[PDB]
């Protein structure tokens, strides 16, 4: 349903840009934190931003490292590019919450806990 937003969850943040979502995780979140938001470069799609690596230097240095993942949203269908595609974003995030998705640079997004919407 259009009134029943699938994004009415704690990990979905309304208006956030690429670095804003990053600032969210790098400053307010922690290792394994993820949040999905509406894409500004790709209007109509969503993005999963995650905090990869630890900030104490047991994975990388220079605080933690945030990667954002593109969630293709066509006809209210969500997919990062892996597994089954869901009509709800909750299933999407939880799917990769158990099955970490990997970048070609080695950065693999370990979705563990959602970044609470600070409002």
């Amino acid at each position: 349903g259009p009134m029943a937003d699938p994004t009415s969850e704690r990990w979905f943040h309304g208006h956030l840009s690429g670095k804003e979502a990053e600032k969210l995780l790098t400053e307010k979140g922690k290792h394994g934190s993820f949040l999905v938001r509406e894409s500004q470069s790709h209007p109509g799609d969503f993005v999963l931003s995650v905090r990869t690596g630890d900030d104490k230097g047991e994975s990388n240095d220079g605080k933690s490292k945030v990667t954002h993942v593109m969630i293709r949203c066509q006809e209210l269908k969500y997919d990062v590019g892996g597994g089954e595609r869901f009509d709800s974003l909750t299933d999407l995030v939880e799917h990769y919450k158990k099955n970490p998705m990997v970048e070609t640079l080695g950065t693999v997004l370990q979705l563990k806990q959602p970044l609470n919407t600070t409002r």
């Binding site: 894409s39 490292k65 970048e103 950065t107 997004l109």
Partner: peptide, 11 residues
């Protein structure tokens, strides 16, 4: 990586 929206290469 930095924004970029990740490659996500499932091997």
């Amino acid at each position: 990586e930095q924004t970029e929206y990740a490659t996500i290469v499932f091997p």
